[PDB]
Amino acid sequence: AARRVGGIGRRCFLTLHCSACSFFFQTSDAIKLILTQQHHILRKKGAASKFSLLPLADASLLLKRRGALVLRSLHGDPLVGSRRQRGEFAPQAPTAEMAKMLNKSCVPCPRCKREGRWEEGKK
Amino acid sequence: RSGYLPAQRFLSLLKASPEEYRSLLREATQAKIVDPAFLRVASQRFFALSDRFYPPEILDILSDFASFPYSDEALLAAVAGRLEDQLVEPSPKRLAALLSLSARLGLCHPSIRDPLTKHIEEKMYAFDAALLASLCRTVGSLLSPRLPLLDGLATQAQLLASDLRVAQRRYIAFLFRCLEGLSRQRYSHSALVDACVACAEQHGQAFPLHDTLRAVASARRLDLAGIEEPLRRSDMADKVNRATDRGDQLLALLRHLDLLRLRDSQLLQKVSEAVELHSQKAAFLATQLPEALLHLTRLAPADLRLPVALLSQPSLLAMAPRLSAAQLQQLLSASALVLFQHIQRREGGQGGDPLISREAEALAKTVERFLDLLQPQFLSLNLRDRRALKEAASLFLVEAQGFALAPKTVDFCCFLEEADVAPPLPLAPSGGVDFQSVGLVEACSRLVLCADREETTTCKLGGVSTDLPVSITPQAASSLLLTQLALIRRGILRHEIQ
Amino acid sequence: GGVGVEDVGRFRLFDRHRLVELLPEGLAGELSRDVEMIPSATSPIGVMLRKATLELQMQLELFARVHAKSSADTDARLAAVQRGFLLDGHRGVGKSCVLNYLIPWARENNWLVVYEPLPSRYAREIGDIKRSSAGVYIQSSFSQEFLERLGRFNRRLLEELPVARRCYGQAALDGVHRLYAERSYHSLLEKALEKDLDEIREQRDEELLLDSQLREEILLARERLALWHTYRREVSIPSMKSRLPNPASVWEIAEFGLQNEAFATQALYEVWEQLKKQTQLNVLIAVDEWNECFPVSEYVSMRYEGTRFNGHIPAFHLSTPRLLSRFDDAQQFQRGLKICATSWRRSNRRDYRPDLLGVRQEEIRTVRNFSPLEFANFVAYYHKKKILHEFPREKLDYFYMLSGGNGFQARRLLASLY
Amino acid sequence: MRRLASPSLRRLQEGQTPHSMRKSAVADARKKIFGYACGMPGEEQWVRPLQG
Amino acid sequence: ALSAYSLRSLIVTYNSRNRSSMNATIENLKNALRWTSPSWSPPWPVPRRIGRRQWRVTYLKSPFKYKYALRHYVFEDHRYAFAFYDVNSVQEVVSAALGAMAGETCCSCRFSWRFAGRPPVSLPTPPRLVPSSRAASLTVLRGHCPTDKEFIRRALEEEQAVERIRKKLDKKQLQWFPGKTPWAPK
Amino acid sequence: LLDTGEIVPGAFASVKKVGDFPLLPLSLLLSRLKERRQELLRDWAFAREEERIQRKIKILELLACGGAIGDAKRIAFLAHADAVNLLLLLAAEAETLARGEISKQEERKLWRLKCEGNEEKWNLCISRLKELALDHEDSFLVFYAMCSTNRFDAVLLPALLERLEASFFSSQALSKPLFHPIFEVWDPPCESFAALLNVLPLSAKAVVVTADRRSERERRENEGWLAPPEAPPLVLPNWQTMHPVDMEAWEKKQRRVVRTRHVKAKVIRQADGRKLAATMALHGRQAIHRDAAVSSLVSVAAMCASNSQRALRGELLPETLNLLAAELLGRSADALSPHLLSLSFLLSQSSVSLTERLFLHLEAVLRGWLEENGFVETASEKRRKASEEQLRNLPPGFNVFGLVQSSPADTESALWESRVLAALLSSFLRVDDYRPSLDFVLLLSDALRNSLRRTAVLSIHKKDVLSLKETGALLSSFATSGYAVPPSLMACLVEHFLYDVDLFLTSSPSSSAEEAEQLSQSFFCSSRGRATPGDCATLLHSLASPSPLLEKLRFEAMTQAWRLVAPVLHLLQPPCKLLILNSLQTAHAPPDVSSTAFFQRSLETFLRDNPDVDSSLLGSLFGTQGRQ
RNA sequence: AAGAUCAUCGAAACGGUAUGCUCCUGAAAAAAA
RNA sequence: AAAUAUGCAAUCAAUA
RNA sequence: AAGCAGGAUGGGAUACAAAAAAAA
C-alpha cells in the first residue's frame, strides 16, 4: 500500500477490459494490439497510405528500437501534460477514447476473439 | 410469511437481473408445480436479457429449460443470436451438449443446426469414446441427419475401436452403442459393421443381457447379414432367467426393451409371465408395476388379455389411492394404449382377437377409477405427464362419446382436452421445411407446423385414415391420429404425413 | 475424555520434540516467532483452541466415521463434507494457528496430511526452471524437495498404500496430463495433415453428379480422420512407467522421483493421482498461504511481457504452485479433503473473490480477532511462558482495546512495551 | 397465429447481432440528443471558444 | 401543458459586496413580505446563509527595487439564499424579492416549474361490508415557511440530486486545454 | 501421560457430546431458596464485601420468606434489582396460578381477576425493564423468567441476548462468581456465568438461537402491507433564528468551538447475539446422540430450522440436519408420537438427503397415532388427551401456525383438535422432498373435516372460530402441494370464515371510504392477530382454483373477501394485489365483483403501476381457469 | 498528497552532470555524437 | 457473528 | 551470520478442453 499502483482508491485510469470475458489490459497494450491486427482491420474495412503502417505488424520489428520508439510516439503520455494541468485540471482517463477507437476498428479480443465490447476500466 | 411465493417469483421475474433470473429459473425447475404462463414469461425475459449472459450461463439456462421440455420463438431467437458466441472456439463437449439440447428442445432450424453440424464435422477427431457415443445417439434421435455427419461418426467409432483393440465389456458396450445409434439412421457403412461382427463372433459369450439386446436391435434395424445368430449360441436363457428373477432387474429389462423398440415374441411372453408372477408381491405393485405395465403396453404384446387382467387386479385398484399421480398417469396411458390396440384390431387395421365386452367393461371401470383418483391430483404432475394424460383423455372421449364412462369422468376428460399444457416446439427436418413461411398451432398436446416395396399399413381413430408404414409404434400412431383429430376440430383438414 | 464446546480458548500443550516430529515441515504462520520469544528452550509450546478449529475437527471426525463405515461395509458419503475448507479473515486472526492445531490432531488420528506452510517458497526462492510445450515451467529441484518434505512424515503411509496401475503412467514430464500434452502439439500436426491432404488431392486429381461429389467428400473426410488419428498415435510423450513399470507402493514412486531429477515433477504428480484414486486412508491437503500461489513469481520471462505482468511469470504457472493452487480437485479426490488458508502479510485482501477461484460461500470459514476471553488467555499464556515482563492486570482491557484483539497487533505491542 | 420466425431471426440473416443492434441504437440516440463531437480532425478548433 | 405548471420552488440568492447592503436587502425583503395580501400566512421563505468568498492581488510597496516589501489587496463577497416553496402568488413573491435589493446587491433567481403528469385515477367509494345470512338469522408559528414539510423534503432531495448530477457532469467535461482529445491531431 | 509428561493424543481424538437439563420452575427455585434460607445465611475491600452480603440478605428476604414492591403506581420507579425481583415473583405467581356451586363460581371469577391483575403487573414490569438497562445477571434472570412463563417481548429480548453474549465472552466469564442468591440453588450448581449458560436448557438455547429480531415495519411488509421507511428528521431554519450575515463576530463572541464542519458518527451493529447464537447452535449439534431425548431433538430441530439467522455456517447446517434426521429415523414410533406437531413443523422447512425417509417414517407414525387416539365418548376422550399431550410437549418459546405452547367443553376440544390436525396437514404438505399420497391426504382432510363439524359453529366468542391466519396457512400449503382442497373441508372453512367475519361485523365497536378503510384496518389489526391481507388473498386464490370443471358459498366468500380487501387494496404489496385480481378474474368468480366500478379502477391502476404485467394473463395465472 | 503502517530485494545497487531519436505547449524549443 | 475486507489534509449538513 | 542517516520494490481468479416414470 506504500507504493501500490492503484492509489488508495485503486484507480485504473489506463486499464481497459472486455465485457465478453475477463480479459483486460492497458492503453499501450491496446496500441500494440491495434498495430499487430492491421490485417483483420483492413479486411473488415474492405506504396499506399492505407497500408503504410503494415511493416509495424512484426513482433521483432516492434521489439527493436526502430519499432519501440514508434510505439512510444504513437502512445504518448496521457498522464503527463503541462504543469498547469493540476488540481481540478489534472488529466482524466483516456480509456473512453481508446475503447471507442478499438470498437470502431473492430479489433479482436485476444482471449475470446470477439468483435465489440471493450468497455472502460477493469471488470 | 403470509405471501404467495409463486406471485412474488413472478414479479421478481418481471423485474430481476440476470443472476436473479437464473435463480428463479432453477427454483421453477426444482419446484413441484409448473406454470406454463410462468415459463412463457421466463422465455420472454431470457430473450430480453440474452445479450447480458455468457455462453456457459446460456447453456445452463438451456439445460434448466430442458429439465421440463419447453421451447418457443423467444428461446429460439435468443439461441440463434448467441450461437456464434457459443461456437467461437468450441470444445467437443460443448458441441455435443448444444446438439443434445437443441434436439431435446426442438430447436430444429438451419441457423441453429448448420454451424453446429459444421463444427462437429470439423472437430470429429477430437471426440472421445463417451462423447462419440452421445453424438451417435443424438444424431440417431434427430431427423434427417447429414450423411457426411453419419459417415464421420462411423469412421471415428471404427478408428476408436481399433485403437482400443472388463476391457471386453467396455469395448462391446461402446461398439454396440455406436452401432445402435447409427442403425437408428440406417445407411451404408462397412468397417464398423465388420468390426462389430468380428467382436460378436469373438466374445459372443461375454455379452451381457443389455449388450445382447442392443446387438439384436441394431442388427434388426440395419438388416445386417448376421450378428444375433452368433449370439443365439450363447445360452441367453440363463441371462433372461437372472433378469426376470428380481423385480428390479425385470423393470430394467422392460425399460431397455422399450428404449430399443424390441418386440420379440419369446422375450415379451417371458416378461409378461414374470410380471404376472411378481404382481403377487405388494412391493412390485407399489413401485415397479405402474411403469412395467406401461412399458409392456408400448411394446404391444400379442395377447391383450394379460395386460387387462394386470390392470384390473382388485388389489391394484385397492392400492391405487396410495399410488402417486405419476403412477396413476402411467396406468391410464397403458389403459389408453390397450384401448387403441383393441380399437385397431376390431376395425381391422391390426390383427388378433379384440377385447370382449367383459374385458372392455373391466378396462372402463379401471380407467374411471384411475381418472377419479387423479382428478384431485392433476396439478401435481409435470408438463409431459399432463400432455400424456391429455392424449389418453382424448382417446377415451373419442372411443366413448363417438366402453362407457361416468359423467364425472367425461367432464374431467373434457377439461383435460380444453386444458393448456404448453406443448414445446416440434421436431422437423431443417432442409425440407421452409421455416421462413411457417406458423405453429396447438393441436391436442403437440405443436404442429403449418404452411400457408413399402407396405402402407393403415390405422383409423374417430374417422381418419393414414397410410402409415408397416412398423408404426402404438403410442406414436395414437398421438398422430389424436393430433390430426385436433387439427380437424381446429379447422385444418389438409394433413400431409411423411 | 475429549474436547468440548466449553473448551474454546484454552491451550493444548505439546512437547517441543513431539511437535517437531509431528510437523517436520515447520510451523505455519508466525508461531515460530512466538516460540523464539519464549526464553526457555525446553518448556512445552501451547496452541489455543478456537471455534473454527473445533468445527473443522467435527467435520473431519464425521468424514472419518462415514468413510470407516463405508470401508467396513465394503449414501453415507453424501452426509459427510466433500471438497474441503477455506480459511479467510484479517491478518493475524489465527488462521495459520488453526492449521497448527488441526494437522497434528489429524496425524495423531492417522490422517495422511500433505502439509505446505510456505507455498510462496516455490515462487520466490531461487531455482532453475524449464518450459514445456504445455506451458508449465518445470522445477525439478523444488519437486524433489517437496517429495522429501512429504516423506519426512508420510513415508510409511505411502509405503503401505498400494499403487493403482490404471492411474499410474499418465503424467507428463511437466506433470500435465498426457492428453493435454498431446493437445499441446496439435498445431504442427494440423499443418502436416494439411500438406498430406493436399498431396492426396493432387493424386486423386491425377487419377481423374451430386452423388459423385458427396461420395468424394465423404471419402476425403474419412481419409482425413484416419490420417489425423495416425499422426496422433505417432505423437509420443515420455513416461516414467518405462523405467518403473511395477511400483509396489507410492513411496517407491516418491523415491524414484527423489533419485531421478528429470522425473521429480512426474513422480509428484503421479503421487497426487494415487492420493486421488486411493481409498485406504483419509487424505488431507493442507495449504497455509494458499493465496500466495496466484500472484506473480520472482521469475521473469519474455512470454509475459506487458503491463498486466511486466515480464513476470505468474506463480501458478510454475509446477509446484500450479499443483497446489487447484481447489476443485478435492471433488475428484475420493477419500480426501482440501483445507486452504489465506494470508495478507504482503498484500491487502482488497476485492478478494474466492468464488472465481472455485470456493463456494458454504466452504468459507472466517477467523476473527480474539474475544476478550481469548485475549486474556493469550496474555496469561504469554506471562506463564515468560515472554512478557511484569504486565499488570489493570491494563488488560486497555491493551485489548489498543490492539483490537488482533493476534499480530497484540503480540507486537506486548513484546515492544513489556 | 404463431409464426416460428421472429423479427430478430429475420434480421440475423444480414448479420446484425443483438449486441451490435443495442449499441447502434444507443449511439444513434446519443448522437441525436447530444451532438456529433466524435473527435474528428479539426474538431478542436470548433470546440475551442473564441477570445477576441 | 403551460397552464398546469406550478412554481415548485423559487430560490433567490442575494450576492452583495457589503454586509450593510446585505442586511438592508434582508430587511427590505422581510418588510415586503410583512405586507402581502391574500390559516393564511405570508409566503415566508426558508433562509439559507452562504459563506464568504475572498480574492487577493499582491503588489510591491515600492516603485523600484525592494522585492521584500509587499502589499495585499483583499476583496470580499457575501451570499444569502432564501427559498420560497409551492409559490402561488408568483407576482407578489417576485416583486418583493426584486424590490428588496439594496445598494449594489445583485440577485440570482432559481425557478423550478413542476408538472404533476397524468392525474391519479379516482377510486370510487369502496363496496360496503354487510352482514350475511348467518348474521341476519342470529403556518401556526410566525416567521416559518407555510408550505408542507414533506413537500419541502421532496424539493430538497430533488435539488440535491440535480446538484450532484451537475457536479459530476461539470467535473467530467472540465478541461484545461478545451477542445483537445487524446490521440487526435494536435 | 507420556514419558515427557504430555497428555496422550488419545485424549483429544474425539469431541464430547452435550447433554440436557430440565427447566426448573421459578416456583421450585423460590421454594428451594426458602428451604435453604438459614444455610445460606450461616455460610455467608471489607466494606464492599459487607455491602454485598447485606444486599444478598435483602434479596433473600424479598424473594423468599422475610408499600411493598407490589405497588402498581410505583412499579415505574423501581431499580434494576427490584424490577427483576418483582418479575421473578410475578412469574412464580403465574406458574402457581396456571398449575356450593355459586361459591365455586365466585372463586373462579376471583381467580380470573387475580390472573388479570398479574398480567397487568407483568406488563408494567416489562415496560420498566425496557426503560432500564440491565446487567448480565439481571438479563439472565429476566430471560429465564420469560422462558418459564412463555412470555416473550419482541423488544426486550434482544438486549438481554446482547448482555448475555457480552458476559459470556468477557474475560471474567469463568472467573467472576455469581452474585444473585438464586444461583446458589441452581441444578447443576454453576460458579461462573459461562458454566450457567452452558447449563441452560436446550429449550433456552433454541430460544436464544431463534430470537425473532424483526421490526414492525418488516413484519407488516411480510404480512402484506406497504410500509415505507420513516423519513429522516429535518430542521428548517426560521426567520426568527436566521444566521447573521457576519458570522465571524458570532464565532468570536463564543466561549468554545460551537460549530464546525459536519461530523456525525453512526452506531454500527456489533454482533447482537450472533456469536452466542452460533455457540448454542454448536451445543445443539453436539447434543445429538443416541442417549438424547426427543424433547431435546425437537430443540435441535428448532435450532436447525429456518431461524432468524443461519447459526450454522455452510456445511454445518446440512450435516446437523442429516444427523438429526438419522437419529429420528433410529427411534421407534412410540418415542415420536408425543412429538409430532413440533418435529414435522420444524423439519418441513428444510430439505436434506434424509428428509424424505424421515417424513415417510413420521407419516407412518402419524397413521398409527390417529388410529390409536381415535381420530379416524372414549374416542373423544382419546382425542382430548392426544391434543393436550401434543400442546404440552410443544417446546417453550415457539409457535406453530399460531398454536401456543400451553394446554388447550366438547366444542373447545374439537376446535383445538381441528387446529392441531390443520397444523399437521400443513406441515406434511409443505415438505419439498416428500409428497404425501392421496390416501394420507384424504385421511387427514377427513379427520380435520370431522373435527370442524364437531366444532360449535358447524354443529359464542371469537375464540370459537378458526382463525383466518390458520385458514390461509392451510390453504397456501394445499395450493403449493398440488392437491385441490377437498370440497367438504373447503365448505367447512368457508363457513367458518363467513361466521367469524359476521361476528366481527356485529361486535365491531364525508367518510365515504374512511369508515371502510378503518373497518378493514381494525379487522387486520395486530391486536386481533387473526386476519391478514395475504391470508385473504390466499383464500381468494383457493376459492378461484377449485376442482376442475357450493357455488353460492363460493360467491359469498369471494364477495366478503373482496369487500374486506378493497378499501385497503392500495395499501398492500403488489404481489397481494396481483393475486387478488387474478383470483377475482377467474371463471369461478362472481361476475358482479369483476363488473363493479371500484374493481375496474383498481385493476386499471394496478396495470398502470405494473406495465410489464399483461392484462390478458390476469385470471389465468398460478393455475387458474380464465373467464374466457 | 508525501513523509506513512506492514512486508521484500539490499549496498558504491548512492549521486544524476552528460548523452541525437520519444512526449507536452505554442505559428515558431531547429540540427546534432 | 452468512456484517466489512478497512490509511490520513488545507471549502462546503444554512445541505453530502 | 546487518552494531544499517543508504538505494530499489509493493501484479487475485473468471466465461475455458487436466487427472480421462419422457420414444429418456
Ligand SMILES: Nc1ncnc2c1ncn2[C@@H]1O[C@H](COP(=O)(O)OP(=O)(O)OP(=O)(O)O)[C@@H](O)[C@H]1O
Ligand atoms: N490459536 C492461537 N494460539 C496462539 N497464538 C495465536 C493463535 N491465533 C493467533 N495467534 C497469534 O496471532 C498471530 C497468528 O498469526 P497467523 O499466521 O496464524 O495469522 P493469519 O490469520 O494466518 O494471518 P496472515 O494473513 O498474516 O497469514 C501470532 O501472533 C500468534 O501468536
Ligand SMILES: [Mg+2]
Ligand atoms: Mg497465516
Ligand SMILES: [Zn+2]
Ligand atoms: Zn474478450
